[PDB]
Amino acid sequence: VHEIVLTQSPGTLSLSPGEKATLSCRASQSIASTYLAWYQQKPGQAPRLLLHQGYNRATGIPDRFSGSGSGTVYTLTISGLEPDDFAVYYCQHLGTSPPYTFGQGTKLEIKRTVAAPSVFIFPPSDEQLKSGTASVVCLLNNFYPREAKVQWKVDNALQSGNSQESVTEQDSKDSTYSLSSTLTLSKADYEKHKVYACEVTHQGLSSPVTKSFNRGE
């Protein structure tokens, strides 16, 4: 395609402090090194310039950050990974004229052993039912890696477009993630069905785990 597209790999880099981090940025066509920059962003703050013109550290950037590459592939390398380095990293194309563009990003996170989620399903409270809406909440607790699939089933009917998820940041003690999914239904439609299941698929599970309940029982 005609336009410039920066594709970063891997989408998620899982390492421990002290290891070497190799982040890649692939351009849809050849790019001069002058027009490539690297950024770091920690959750809740603005991005920070790491490298400019492909290889040059910005003011105040420690020595462990370095860049390499040419043409269509450029690399950001972190030699001795520090705990402060776990964040999101973007590459940018900033040529002699706009438009500029960024890569989709690479999340550098803490590596740990694979742990399966403990799944819980919560029926809607009677307090909420007295308002006209029914929220069914499913909990995925302390799992790793972050890649998890949550499928809602109402009377064995796979749901779609009526749920919302959110994931916590990587825990500071056990380095796991947690996930919460809410299935929203009107109170009337909620009284028309029986089985409400939360089917979870994760790398730590040899087969999908289903947490369900029967309305009324």
Q: Side chain identity at 118, as an amino acid letter?
A: S
Tell me if 55 contacts other proteins by CB under 8 A. Answer: no
Tell me if 104 contacts other proteins by CB under 8 A. Answer: yes
Q: How many CB atoms neighbour CB 114 within 10 A?
A: 10
Among 67, 69, 117, 124, binds other proteins (CB under 8 A): 124
Tell me if 128 contacts other proteins by CB under 8 A. Answer: yes
Tell me if 26 contacts other proteins by CB under 8 A. Answer: no
Beta partners for 99? Answer: none
Tell me if 125 contacts other proteins by CB under 8 A. Answer: yes
Cα separation, 78 vs 76, whole angstroms = 7
Residues 58-87 that bind other proteins (CB under 8 A): 58-59
Cα separation, 129 vs 127, whole angstroms = 6
Among 75, 77, 159, 180, binds other proteins (CB under 8 A): 180
The distance of closest approach from Cβ of residue 113 to other proteins in the complex, given in angstroms and rounded to an integer, is 19
Cα separation, 196 vs 215, whole angstroms = 8
SS3 state at 42: coil
Tell me if 212 contacts other proteins by CB under 8 A. Answer: no
